[PDB]
């Protein structure tokens, strides 16, 4: 069934030397055969990152791209360029782009449709703010975000969804395992009404927001939690502990 | 006199193959002893480009970067990352970012201060729209764009300014050499008023906006036109002709 997936969003962090250390650790640590690990460095290091990987479980992804593959768009990344250097995924719709860079629902959907069409997988990020939660709107927010994408994308085969409560990102306080499980099951039921029971059952839904080496094992018995999108802990040795948390 | 400067903004274009073609053409081209050439590929190719350059007049620049060097800013580029792979400049304020990505004047000023602060050179872009041109607002606009930068930055030692006739992009207007000379002379006089006449006589002010290997030579004799920020021609063999246009 759903292969365990651990993504590593380095965000605006890293050097050739520090990424070398991170990838060398993955190449020589023992990690399960049954895991998919996707490291996502800044664009400046994508090629270099791919060149260092020596384990089939590990691939590389980009942190954002535009909705065209080439043209007069100074400063953007292109999914074709990401493919050209050997990367396999792109993160779209991260909380930080939706907020600081005003990426709206439709922009995210258009980008997703475009990236899939070019053969690149998408780690699709969704999630609510502390104010939205406090008003009981967690599900209304995440179904709006997903509905926007579903109006443009009808096959999620090469999509991985990351549920990241915005209030849990980089604070050190994750959502409880129990709450994650419940929201994850609600997401999966909603999505089965749109994509069908079968796709719903096969779709990885990741938890993200202060996932770390310490708490990753506390989500191991949560059947609707299929892995993690890890931010800060992805820069650290405990990233390996997270990948091994269901060993 | 000011050193002739030619920047090449690849925009969202490139592949490992094409970058190799472009750089190895420059490496073995006859070019003036003292020209400064800056090639600006997508971030995905910055390191590979630096590794292929074998010409002292040629250095590599990024097309955009954020106003902090590290942190939780998924998808951004960092001037410290640019520095780490041996690139030396960043383009800031390009019209395509000002428009499509809503980068405001103060955003650009904060980025400029930060990059110079980290020891990376800036290609600072300014320019008015067609609608602004027709309203008579050309100098009002470029003074407003520059005054925002001057709120943060008065040392333009490691800056070059590129004037982008955005009013000539697909609009059925041509930006003539005499047109360019007058506006460059006006910008220089305004900057002399703010930075003093020595700083103003040392500043390179570049022409940007539908520049090629055929028309470059027509700007040869314009005193206040110190070089180019080349778009589409920078992908082509004729970029070498532009560099040699004052020969």
CA–centroid distance for B123 within its chain: 4
Tell me which residue in B11, B68, B73 faces A74 most closely, judged by beta carbons.
Answer: B11
CA–centroid distance for A53 within its chain: 19
Give the integer Cα–Cα distance in Å for A37 and A160.
12
Put simply, the answer to whether A72 touches B48 (Cβ < 8 Å) is no
Q: Binding residue per annotation — A106?
A: no
Q: Nearest 5 degrees, angle CA B132-CA A70-CA A121?
A: 130
- B45 CB neighbours in chain A (<8 A) are 47, 81
- B47 CB neighbours in chain A (<8 A) are 16, 44-45, 47-48
- A167 CB neighbours in chain B (<8 A) are none
Containing domain of residue B184, as a range?
Answer: 1-247
DSSP state of B8: E
Q: Which of B10, B14, B44, B168 to probe by mutation at the A interface, max A CB count within 10 Å?
A: B44
User: Which residues sit opposite A6 in a β-bridge?
Assistant: A37, A228
A-B Cβ pairs (cutoff 8 Å, strict) = 128
- A229 CB neighbours in chain B (<8 A) are none
E strands present in B12-92? 36-40, 58-62, 89-92
Among candidate residues B226, B231, B233, the one with its CA nearest the CA of residue B35: B226
Paired tokens of A175: 């959502």
Give the integer Cα–Cα distance in Å for A181 and A143.
16
- A77 CB neighbours in chain B (<8 A) are 42-44, 75
3-class secondary-structure state, position B208: strand
Give the integer Cα–Cα distance in Å for A87 and B215.
40
Task: Characterize B77-111 residue by residue with b for buried, 16 or more Cβ atoms within 10 angstroms of its Cβ, and e for exposed.
Answer: bbbbbbbbbebbbbbbbbbbbbeebebebebbbbb
> Which residues make Cβ contacts (< 8 Å) with residue B38, sequence separation at least 6?
B5, B6, B7, B8, B58, B59, B60, B61, B88, B89, B121, B123
DSSP state of B12: B
Residue A244 sits in a domain of what CATH number?
A: 3.20.20.70
CA–centroid distance for A13 within its chain: 17
Give the integer Cα–Cα distance in Å for B191 and B201.
10
Q: Residue B9: which H helix or E strand, with range?
A: strand B5-9
Give the integer Cα–Cα distance in Å for B243 and B247.
9
Q: Which residue is associated with the tokens 């002893």?
A: B33
Relative orientation angle of helices B138-150 and B177-195, to the nearest 10 degrees: 40
Residues in chain A: 247
Q: Which backbone phi and psi does A58 adopt, to 5 degrees?
A: -105, 120
3-class secondary-structure state, position B243: helix
Cβ(B59)–Cβ(B87) below 8 Å: yes
Q: How many CB atoms lie within 10 A of CB A84?
A: 18
Closest residue in chain A to residue B78, using alpha carbons only: A12
Give the integer Cα–Cα distance in Å for B42 and B19.
10
Count of CA atoms in the C-beta half-sphere (13 A) of B45: 31
Give the integer Cα–Cα distance in Å for A87 and B150.
41
Give the integer Cα–Cα distance in Å for B137 and B114.
29
Total domains in the fold of chain B = 1
As a three-state string, the secondary structure of chain A is CCCEEEEEECCECCCHHHHHHHHHHHHHCCCCCCEEEEEECCHHHHHHHHHHCCCCCEEEEECCCCCCCCECCCCCCCHHHHHHCCCCEEEECCHHHHHHCCCCHHHHHHHHHHHHHCCCEEEEEECCCHHHHHCCCHHHHHHHHHHHHHCCCCCCCCEEEEECCHHHCCCCCCCCHHHHHHHHHHHHHHHHHHHCHHHHHHCCEEEECCCCCCCHHHHCCCCCCCEEEECHHHHCCHHHHHHCCCC
Helix, strand, coil tally for chain B in percent (to 5): 45, 15, 40
Q: Which active-site residues of A does the annotation give?
A: 94, 164
Q: Nearest 5 degrees, angle CA A132-CA A137-CA A142?
A: 95
CB-count exposure of residue B46 (10 Å: 0-12, 13-18, 19+): buried
Give the integer Cα–Cα distance in Å for A189 and B49.
48
- B164 is known as an active-site residue: yes
Cβ(A45)–Cβ(A20) below 8 Å: no
Among candidate residues A226, A240, A233, the one with its CA nearest the CA of residue A211: A233
Give the integer Cα–Cα distance in Å for B160 and B125.
9
CB-count exposure of residue B196 (10 Å: 0-12, 13-18, 19+): exposed
Nearest CA-CA distance, residue A91 and chain B, Å: 9
Q: Residue B124: which H helix or E strand, with range?
A: strand B121-126
Q: Which residue is associated with the tokens 């001037």?
A: B79
Cβ(A203)–Cβ(A188) below 8 Å: yes
Nearest CA-CA distance, residue B189 and chain A, Å: 29
> Which residues make Cβ contacts (< 8 Å) with residue A216, sequence separation at least 6?
A228, A241, A242, A245
User: Which residues sit opposite B58 in a β-bridge?
Assistant: B37
Put simply, the answer to whether B78 touches A46 (Cβ < 8 Å) is no
- B102 is known as an active-site residue: no
3-class secondary-structure state, position B5: strand
User: Which residues sit opposite A9 in a β-bridge?
Assistant: A40
Give the integer Cα–Cα distance in Å for B159 and B139.
20
Chain A residues with CB under 8 Å of a chain B CB are: 9, 11-16, 42-48, 63-64, 66, 68-78, 80-82, 84-85, 91, 94-97, 100-102, 169-170, 231
DSSP state of B29: S
Q: How many CB atoms lie within 10 A of CB B17?
A: 9
Region of A116 on the Ramachandran plot (φ > 0 left; ψ -120 to 50 alpha; else beta): alpha
Put simply, the answer to whether A74 touches B97 (Cβ < 8 Å) is yes
Any idea of the CA torsion for A55, A89, A212, A133, to the nearest 10 degrees? -160
Q: How many CB atoms lie within 10 A of CB B140?
A: 12
Region of B53 on the Ramachandran plot (φ > 0 left; ψ -120 to 50 alpha; else beta): beta
Any idea of the CA torsion for A85, A21, B87, B51, to the nearest 10 degrees? -60
């Amino acid at each position: 069934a759903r292969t365990f997936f651990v993504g590593g969003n380095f965000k605006l962090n890293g050097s050739k030397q520090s990424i070398k250390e991170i990838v060398e650790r993955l190449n020589t640590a023992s990690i399960p055969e049954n895991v998919e690990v996707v490291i996502c460095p800044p664009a400046t290091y994508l090629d270099y990152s791919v060149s260092l990987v020596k384990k089939p479980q590990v691939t590389v992804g980009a942190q954002n791209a535009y909705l065209k593959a080439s043209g007069a768009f100074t400063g953007e990344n292109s999914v074709d360029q990401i493919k050209d250097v050997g990367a396999k995924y792109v993160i779209l719709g991260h909380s930080e782009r939706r907020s600081y860079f005003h990426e709206d629902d439709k922009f995210i959907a258009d980008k997703t449709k475009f990236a899939l069409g070019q053969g690149v997988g998408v780690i699709l990020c969704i999630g609510e703010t502390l104010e939205e939660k406090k008003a009981g709107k967690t599900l209304d927010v995440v179904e709006r975000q997903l509905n926007a994408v579903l109006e443009e994308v009808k096959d999620f085969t090469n999509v991985v969804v990351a549920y990241e409560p915005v209030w849990a990102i980089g604070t050190g306080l994750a959502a409880t395992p129990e709450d994650a499980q419940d929201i994850h099951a609600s997401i999966r039921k909603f999505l089965a009404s749109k994509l069908g029971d079968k796709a719903a059952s096969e779709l990885r839904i990741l938890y993200g927001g202060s996932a770390n080496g310490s708490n990753a094992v506390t989500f191991k018995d949560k059947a609707d939690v299929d892995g993690f999108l890890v931010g800060g802990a992805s820069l650290k040795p405990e990233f390996v502990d997270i990948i091994n948390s269901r060993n």
